[PDB]
Design a protein around this motif. Structure first.
Motif, mmCIF file in Angstrom:
data_model
loop_
_atom_site.group_PDB
_atom_site.id
_atom_site.type_symbol
_atom_site.label_atom_id
_atom_site.label_comp_id
_atom_site.label_asym_id
_atom_site.label_seq_id
_atom_site.Cartn_x
_atom_site.Cartn_y
_atom_site.Cartn_z
ATOM 1 N N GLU A 198 0.775 -1.079 -0.012
ATOM 2 C CA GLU A 198 -0.080 0.073 0.106
ATOM 3 C C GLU A 198 0.934 1.114 -0.072
ATOM 4 O O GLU A 198 0.590 2.001 -0.811
ATOM 5 C CB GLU A 198 -0.880 -0.004 1.374
ATOM 6 N N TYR A 199 1.793 1.290 1.064
ATOM 7 C CA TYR A 199 2.715 2.524 1.064
ATOM 8 C C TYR A 199 3.861 2.532 0.188
ATOM 9 O O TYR A 199 4.886 3.235 0.214
ATOM 10 C CB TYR A 199 2.773 2.957 2.588
ATOM 11 N N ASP A 200 4.031 1.490 -0.427
ATOM 12 C CA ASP A 200 5.348 1.185 -0.973
ATOM 13 C C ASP A 200 5.719 2.114 -2.192
ATOM 14 O O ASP A 200 4.876 2.845 -2.891
ATOM 15 C CB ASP A 200 5.226 -0.128 -1.869
ATOM 16 N N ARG A 201 7.081 2.316 -2.430
ATOM 17 C CA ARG A 201 7.417 3.101 -3.386
ATOM 18 C C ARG A 201 7.442 2.871 -4.855
ATOM 19 O O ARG A 201 6.777 1.882 -5.209
ATOM 20 C CB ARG A 201 8.948 3.484 -2.953
ATOM 21 N N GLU A 202 8.226 3.303 -5.555
ATOM 22 C CA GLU A 202 8.481 3.053 -7.076
ATOM 23 C C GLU A 202 9.480 2.006 -6.848
ATOM 24 O O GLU A 202 10.400 2.193 -7.658
ATOM 25 C CB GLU A 202 8.763 4.164 -7.863
ATOM 26 N N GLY A 203 9.225 0.711 -6.615
ATOM 27 C CA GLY A 203 10.359 -0.208 -6.334
ATOM 28 C C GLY A 203 9.644 -1.713 -5.812
ATOM 29 O O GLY A 203 9.972 -2.584 -6.570
ATOM 30 N N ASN A 204 8.630 -1.462 -5.091
ATOM 31 C CA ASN A 204 7.913 -2.820 -4.577
ATOM 32 C C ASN A 204 8.772 -3.758 -3.946
ATOM 33 O O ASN A 204 9.861 -4.122 -4.349
ATOM 34 C CB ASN A 204 7.352 -3.487 -5.935
ATOM 35 N N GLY A 205 8.512 -3.952 -2.738
ATOM 36 C CA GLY A 205 9.128 -4.941 -1.863
ATOM 37 C C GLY A 205 10.005 -4.079 -0.742
ATOM 38 O O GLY A 205 10.175 -4.370 0.261
ATOM 39 N N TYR A 206 10.921 -3.233 -1.335
ATOM 40 C CA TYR A 206 11.726 -2.232 -0.666
ATOM 41 C C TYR A 206 11.028 -0.905 -0.423
ATOM 42 O O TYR A 206 10.336 -0.375 -1.086
ATOM 43 C CB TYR A 206 13.199 -2.177 -1.314
ATOM 44 N N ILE A 207 11.704 -0.216 0.531
ATOM 45 C CA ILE A 207 11.513 1.088 1.154
ATOM 46 C C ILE A 207 12.570 1.747 1.646
ATOM 47 O O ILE A 207 13.489 1.066 1.958
ATOM 48 C CB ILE A 207 10.235 0.964 1.777
ATOM 49 N N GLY A 208 12.375 2.985 1.713
ATOM 50 C CA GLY A 208 13.591 4.017 2.328
ATOM 51 C C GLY A 208 13.288 4.236 3.916
ATOM 52 O O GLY A 208 12.242 4.072 4.253
ATOM 53 N N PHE A 209 14.238 4.763 4.580
ATOM 54 C CA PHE A 209 14.274 5.043 5.970
ATOM 55 C C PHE A 209 12.915 5.881 6.031
ATOM 56 O O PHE A 209 12.327 5.815 6.971
ATOM 57 C CB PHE A 209 15.608 5.459 6.450
ATOM 58 N N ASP A 210 12.966 7.062 5.388
ATOM 59 C CA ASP A 210 12.053 7.940 5.344
ATOM 60 C C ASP A 210 10.502 7.413 5.228
ATOM 61 O O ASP A 210 9.690 7.667 5.918
ATOM 62 C CB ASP A 210 12.207 9.053 4.288
ATOM 63 N N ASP A 211 10.323 6.422 4.484
ATOM 64 C CA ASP A 211 8.810 5.633 4.299
ATOM 65 C C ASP A 211 8.658 4.768 5.420
ATOM 66 O O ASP A 211 7.622 4.772 5.902
ATOM 67 C CB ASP A 211 9.106 4.928 3.079
ATOM 68 N N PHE A 212 9.774 4.581 6.238
ATOM 69 C CA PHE A 212 9.342 3.669 7.383
ATOM 70 C C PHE A 212 9.222 4.289 8.663
ATOM 71 O O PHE A 212 8.687 4.057 9.476
ATOM 72 C CB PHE A 212 10.546 2.803 7.729
ATOM 73 N N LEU A 213 9.912 5.583 8.356
ATOM 74 C CA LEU A 213 9.765 6.636 9.459
ATOM 75 C C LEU A 213 8.250 7.063 9.689
ATOM 76 O O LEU A 213 7.940 7.274 10.744
ATOM 77 C CB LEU A 213 10.597 7.740 9.292
ATOM 78 N N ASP A 214 7.663 7.445 8.563
ATOM 79 C CA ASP A 214 6.097 7.668 8.739
ATOM 80 C C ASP A 214 5.381 6.596 9.331
ATOM 81 O O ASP A 214 4.085 6.902 9.855
ATOM 82 C CB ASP A 214 5.656 8.010 7.478
ATOM 83 N N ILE A 215 5.729 5.511 9.531
ATOM 84 C CA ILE A 215 5.168 4.123 10.045
ATOM 85 C C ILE A 215 5.340 4.461 11.692
ATOM 86 O O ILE A 215 4.487 3.990 12.471
ATOM 87 C CB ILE A 215 5.567 3.123 9.328
ATOM 88 N N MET A 216 6.640 4.371 11.875
ATOM 89 C CA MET A 216 6.950 4.555 13.313
ATOM 90 C C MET A 216 6.455 5.708 13.906
ATOM 91 O O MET A 216 6.211 5.753 15.106
ATOM 92 C CB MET A 216 8.582 4.206 13.622
ATOM 93 N N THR A 217 6.276 6.862 13.010
ATOM 94 C CA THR A 217 5.538 7.963 13.465
ATOM 95 C C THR A 217 3.875 7.691 12.967
ATOM 96 O O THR A 217 3.258 8.969 13.583
ATOM 97 C CB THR A 217 6.206 9.041 12.717
ATOM 98 N N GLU A 218 3.756 6.729 12.259
ATOM 99 C CA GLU A 218 2.362 6.448 11.997
ATOM 100 C C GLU A 218 1.444 6.532 13.012
ATOM 101 O O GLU A 218 0.448 7.151 13.323
ATOM 102 C CB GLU A 218 2.126 5.379 10.955
#
Length: 77
Positions: free
Chosen positions: A51-71
């Motif tokens: 759902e929140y995946d980037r233009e890569g599928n499967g992987y993500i960047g620290f920023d994308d993970f951060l909004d989750i721990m901040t989610e």
């Protein structure tokens, strides 16, 4: 964020980074989301990141993970 704050997040990120790249895959997200504390099982766990995946599928960047721990706190409702 402040760096002390990010450290909480990144200490986990450095831990869950098993693929070794500073970018997390849904493979690794399983133990990550566990440590965070959700309940999704296999079906909802890959789709979770997908759902929140980037233009890569499967992987993500620290920023994308951060909004989750901040989610779950920024939207703690």
């Amino acid at each position: 964020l402040s760096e002390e704050q990010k450290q909480e997040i990144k200490e986990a990120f450095d831990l869950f980074d098993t693929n070794k790249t500073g970018s997390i895959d849904y493979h690794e997200l399983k133990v990550a989301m566990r440590a965070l504390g959700f309940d999704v099982k296999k079906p909802e766990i890959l789709e979770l990141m997908n759902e929140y995946d980037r233009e890569g599928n499967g992987y993500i960047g620290f920023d994308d993970f951060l909004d989750i721990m901040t989610e779950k706190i920024k939207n703690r409702d």
